[PDB]
Write a protein that binds this ligand. Structure first.
Ligand SMILES: O=C(NCc1ccccc1)c1ccc2cc1OCCOCCNc1ccn3ncc-2c3n1
Length: 266
C-alpha cells in the first residue's frame, strides 16, 4: 500500500459511541470520510509491541488484505495512514456487524458465501486461522446481508507440500514425532468452518466442556453423535456436511472446493 503520512483526522471524522473492536495492539473505530460522508472502519494498530518494533506485523496484515482485494467476501482496504506510533488501516464498513439458532436456509446461503471467500483465500495459499463468529461480518442484519471476512492477524501464507517435502529431509532419518505430527494447513480452516456450521444450525458449541481441559479433550477424542434434539428439524444433508468437516485427521477433511459441491449447498 501507499502509506499516507498526512494526519488521518484531516480526511475523516471519528464517530462517537462505543468503539467497534479492541484488542491488545489495536482498536477499530467507526468513522466518516469528510469528503463523501461515507462510513468506514478505522483500525488503529500500534507499531511498538512488548517493547519491540512490530511494524512488520501490520505490514503483513495489509499484504493479506491486498492479496484478497478482488475477493468480494473479504473486507476491503481503502487507505493506510501512519504516525510515529500507529499505522491506521481505513477499512470498509460492514453495517451488519458480527453474524452473532439461525434457520437452516439462512445458514445454507451464508455458508456458501463464507466458503467462496475461504476457497479464494486457499486458492491464494492464505490460511486464515481465526475463522469464528466474531470475524464473520454481515453487510446487513435485517434482512441478513452478505458476509465479509475480517481480521487476518493470525493468517499465514503456507508453503506447498513440495516445500514441505524438502523441509522434511531424507526419510530414513525422520523421528517418529515428525511422522505423527499434523502441521497447520488449509484443512485447519475447514475444521473451524465445521464448528461454525454446527453452532449456526443448532446454537450449541459442539466441543465446549465444563472447563478448558475438557474442551481440548473433546476436540481430540469426542465423536459427535449429532442426535441431540436440535438436529430433528435439520436435513440429513446438513448433518453430513458437518461430518465431512469435523474429521479429526486433517487429510480426511473436506476442502472448500468440495464443500461448495456438497449437496447441502446445491
Ligand atoms: O480486524 C478486525 N478485527 C481484528 C482485531 C480488531 C481489533 C484489534 C485487534 C484485532 C476488524 C476489522 C474491521 C471490522 C471488525 C473487525 O473485527 C472485530 C469484529 O467486531 C465487530 C464489530 N462491529 C463491526 C461493524 C462494522 N465493521 N466494519 C468493519 C469492522 C466492523 N465491525
Amino acid at each position: 500500500s501507499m502509506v499516507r503520512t498526512e494526519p488521518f483526522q484531516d480526511g475523516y471524522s471519528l464517530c462517537p459511541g462505543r468503539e467497534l473492536g479492541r484488542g491488545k495492539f489495536a482498536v477499530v473505530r467507526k468513522c466518516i470520510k469528510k469528503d463523501s460522508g461515507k462510513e468506514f472502519a478505522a483500525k488503529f494498530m500500534r507499531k511498538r509491541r512488548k517493547g519491540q518494533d512490530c511494524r512488520m506485523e501490520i505490514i503483513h496484515e495489509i499484504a493479506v488484505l491486498e492479496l484478497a482485494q478482488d475477493n468480494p467476501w473479504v473486507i476491503n482496504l481503502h487507505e493506510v495512514y501512519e504516525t510515529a506510533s500507529e499505522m491506521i488501516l481505513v477499512l470498509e464498513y460492514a453495517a451488519g456487524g458480527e453474524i452473532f439458532a439461525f434457520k437452516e436456509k439462512d445458514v445454507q446461503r451464508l455458508m456458501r458465501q463464507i466458503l467462496e471467500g475461504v476457497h479464494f483465500l486457499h486458492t491464494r495459499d492464505v490460511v486464515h486461522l481465526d475463522l469464528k463468529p466474531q470475524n464473520i461480518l454481515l453487510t446487513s442484519e435485517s434482512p441478513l446481508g452478505d458476509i465479509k471476512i475480517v481480521d487476518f492477524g493470525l493468517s499465514r501464507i503456507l508453503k506447498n507440500s513440495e516445500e514441505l517435502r524438502e523441509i522434511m529431509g531424507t526419510p530414513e532419518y525422520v523421528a517418529p514425532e515428525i511422522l505423527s505430527y499434523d502441521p497447520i494447513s488449509m484443512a485447519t480452516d475447514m475444521w473451524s468452518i465445521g464448528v461454525l456450521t454446527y453452532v449456526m444450525l443448532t446454537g450449541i458449541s459442539p466441543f465446549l466442556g465444563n472447563d478448558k481441559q475438557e474442551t481440548f479433550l473433546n476436540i481430540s477424542q469426542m465423536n459427535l453423535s449429532y442426535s441431540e434434539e436440535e438436529f430433528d428439524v435439520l436435513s440429513e444433508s446438513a448433518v453430513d456436511f458437518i461430518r465431512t468437516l469435523l474429521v479429526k485427521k486433517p487429510e480426511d477433511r473436506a476442502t472448500a472446493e468440495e464443500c461448495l459441491k456438497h449437496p447441502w449447498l446445491t
